[PDB]
Amino acid sequence: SNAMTTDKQTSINLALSTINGKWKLSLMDELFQGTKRNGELMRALDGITQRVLTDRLREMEKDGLVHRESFNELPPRVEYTLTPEGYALYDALSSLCHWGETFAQKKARLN
């Protein structure tokens, strides 16, 4: 928030720790396009195992980034989405991404 009482380094670090784990950025990219079922994520993310996938989603749900909704259907259907904070972190990361893209292109141009 840039509140003067907030230690910036500690809270940058804490924020990154929720999203820096293997697959998590890819997972977030998939959920940003829209609601996803387990099988869709299994297909979209090449070489991820179901054990790794559920582990990731569990951590991300815990951290408040991913919402898991179960539908009482025949058979039940489980939807994954980004939370509001999930979307907010997606946006912060896209801004950094945009920064690093511009910077890397300047380096290539002047090298």
Place this chain on the structure above:
Amino acid sequence: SNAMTTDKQTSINLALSTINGKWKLSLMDELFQGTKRNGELMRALDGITQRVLTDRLREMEKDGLVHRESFNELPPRVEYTLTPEGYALYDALSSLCHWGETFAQKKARL
């Protein structure tokens, strides 16, 4: 920009690498409100030596984050500010920071 051709992971890591150097987040914070002289920065950052203050500022200038302005007056003086790129990276880190803050606060209430 989330263009089809950009790897986001690599882009994020590159941005972070420019400010992960010790002191740099703090320098960038001191420069936000505007122009700073070497002595002001020295006094604001406890334990920084002139040597590493100059080393950081030089790296941040090379990375296009910091502008170094030389004034040719009596006597000459140098002033440091953030560039538009520097401000753009600062904004992006602030959004990240805000998120960690909300997260720690939520954790604290529980």
